[model samples]
Target: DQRFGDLVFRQLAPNVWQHTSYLDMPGFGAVASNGLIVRDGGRVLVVDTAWTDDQTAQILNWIKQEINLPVALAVVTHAHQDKMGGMDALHAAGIATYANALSNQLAPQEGMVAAQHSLTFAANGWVEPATAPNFGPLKVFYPGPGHTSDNITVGIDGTDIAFGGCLIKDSKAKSLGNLGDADTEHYAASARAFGAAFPKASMIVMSHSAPDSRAAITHTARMADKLR
Candidate 1:
């Protein structure tokens, strides 16, 4: 496990740890993708696996060192490769995977073929899981179709932290990307739904960066304004 800078693990709650993986790679723009590790009652809940097999392996190795608990759940924020590419690794470790229902439906048919081809070029990787579980603390919410049509945000009850998935990026990159499968009109509605779902969340974590303050909710709300 390679710990970068002060980029070590941070605890968001009692057993929830934000495991940040900073990359110096090119073409990814300024922000480095992050993976969240929520350790609850000896079971670890991983959010958004890293981009490559080596990266995912490094994270798994790190978790092994800290605790022997198997990864109980994994939440793939979207259908993008960077987020769901490492599903195979986590599944191999006996971890149950989860994603928005839409993502699960689309990934295997279209996303998996590409993901498999990409991993084949890598030195080490595994096959994508055929299925995953769907569970969340939020009501009438299933991530959303923002960054991608199959994105889902996770809400940890009783914590200021709300995993915004990729719907609400940090201020540095606030503009929404081209969501080919998304309904632009409904996108705002989705963000609004998330905001209403977690009225107490002061801290927001995107799938690709560190945590942000409650302002992210406002940011998302503003984005919704443009959509309207």
Candidate 2:
């Protein structure tokens, strides 16, 4: 536990763990950031990153010492620090990272570096499927834009789990937070589209809040409903 230090996490589902860590923000002081780790055979898939490179290294330490696997790919959900801050660590570990092209563009504008690999939300990657490429058993897809112009969601193939990222807010979130870069007119539509794509996901895990039922999707739609 001490080896993991600031990184606090818990398993949310099979081969899925929700990782939470803290970081100091200029506006508020210490704020919690969220990340998700998925076990894929001998390798791991990390969704998002810790608030800082050090914390992310701690996460990597956990993976090596505890999980006993290497991180194969890191998926950045957005351009914000909560999502992209740990990029340096991921790079140090030689783990490939994927992010929406828009996010990669926005991160540098925000004074933060983006992921090494950028993919258009529309076409996704050059791998195989134009959309929803296979991730072991699960897949990742881009459903419109909600929280940001490049936000996307991840879905597990067989299980009832969807890592909604920051697009879908946590329970404590009264409404979608940090609307500075949000597409208000299309926020609800984006969230709705992602939810529609995976109706079977009984549990939706979010960044920075407690996990909840599918009701969180409905709640997000309502929050975005009055925006446009």
Candidate 3:
């Protein structure tokens, strides 16, 4: 029922939804990107944004009408347009956004809006939000470098759901997709890091495809190894 041009939202879990938006690439034609919307009882946590601000506005409108809760927090998975292009819309709506420190630094260089909050890595494992009632059950993890130097993954705590952004690919993907900003030298290692970090994750939400399984990480790593 809710549709914005080619952009649409679908339920993945009772509390998790996925939004698919389109962008016409020069040679790729109408390419689609995916982001996640996770709602807790009080607020929502958005992962990444649509390819354009207008599309993101539609997403925000849908959230206002459907979820009916304030967007407590948002995170841009990387500095790519397909990931952070709608940052302006999120900013305009006053949504507090977070990203890895490197992503925040690289976003402006890519002409993208840097997230409001920055998560810096001190150790291994995952980085959970410092405060409560802000980003509920969401954990951000930086797995070295893969698709991009700043690519990170978001996992829902106490749930088997994980958002791998563009760092991982779908089962049907034959190639690595886009390696323009990828770390070819460390891609395989990074993909392995993701797999190691989220061993229990079964339903992985990726940016360019439908929700995949933990095996996708292995497949991605195998693919990245070929590029080495």
Candidate 4:
């Protein structure tokens, strides 16, 4: 019914959905950013947010009306506005928010709300919710730095879906959209590390484009390397 709105929800798998919203950039016009609405049993885990508070409210409404599941957890993949701009809405909805510790520190600096829960990557550079078991099937990894100093990736176990956030570019992206906070020196290495973390992920849901195959990681690595 609300398909005409700025928000679009698409089912990627039986229990995984993609939520896209538009962000109007000065020179780029309207760009679409993607997030995920994943259901695991009676709980829902949302990845990222639509670009603003009102847009995120739309997502909550849709979930309540359609999925009818309690959103137990939400994750912000990075500190960027596109990822955490809706933190207030999520907090208002009483959803428990989670993000990398680094993201929490950078969030307020970016004028965004930090997640209620903080997670730090292991010395191995990644962390999984398996130890907790209550958070459902998700893994977080920090592959050094790329799009941002604290950019991280989320992989949904058993779904083969990886939320690359703003670290990995889409297949059709000829240019790395925003490099204001990018680490060009380690961007390529970071992308490659992301690839190694999810070798079997066929559906890589990037923040700014349609879901693509794992090859997008390789493509991003190649692109980042050329920047050097």
Model 4: weakest 10-residue lDDT segment is 127-136
Residue 29 of model 4 has an lDDT of 93
What candidate 2 gets wrong by more than 4 Å, as runs, is 1-3, 26-29, 123-134
Model 2 score (lDDT): 0.79
Cα lDDT tens digits, model 4, 1-228, are: 136256888888889888988889898798888888889989998999779999999999989987999999898888988899899999999998888888899988898889998877776677745422366677778888899998988888888898889998877679877999999999999998988888888899998878998778888888998999
Stretch of 10 with least lDDT, candidate 2 = 124-133
After superposition, the stretches of candidate 1 with alpha carbons farther than 4 Å from their true spots are 1-8, 22-31, 113-140, 172-174, 177-182
TM-score of candidate 4 versus the correct structure, residues matched by position: 0.94
* Cα TM-score of candidate 1: 0.76
lDDT of 2 by residue, 123-175 (tens): 43222344324457556778787888888788776678887888897544587
Higher-lDDT candidate among 1 and 4?
4
lDDT of 4 at 221: 89
Model 2: number of backbone collisions: 0
On residues 85-196, what C-alpha lDDT tens digit does candidate 1 reach at each position?
6777776676666665556667776554122211111111111223332333322245344556656666775567777776776656567654665667667766766777
List ranges where model 4 is wrong by over 4 Å.
Answer: 1-4, 128-133
Per-prediction RMSD in angstroms? Answer: 7.9, 2.7, 1.8, 1.9
CA lDDT, every model vs. true structure: 0.62, 0.79, 0.86, 0.86
Query: With candidate 4 superimposed using the best TM-score fit, by how many Å does residue 34's alpha carbon deviate from the native?
Result: 0.2
Query: How far is 15's C-alpha from truth in model 2 (Å)?
Result: 1.1
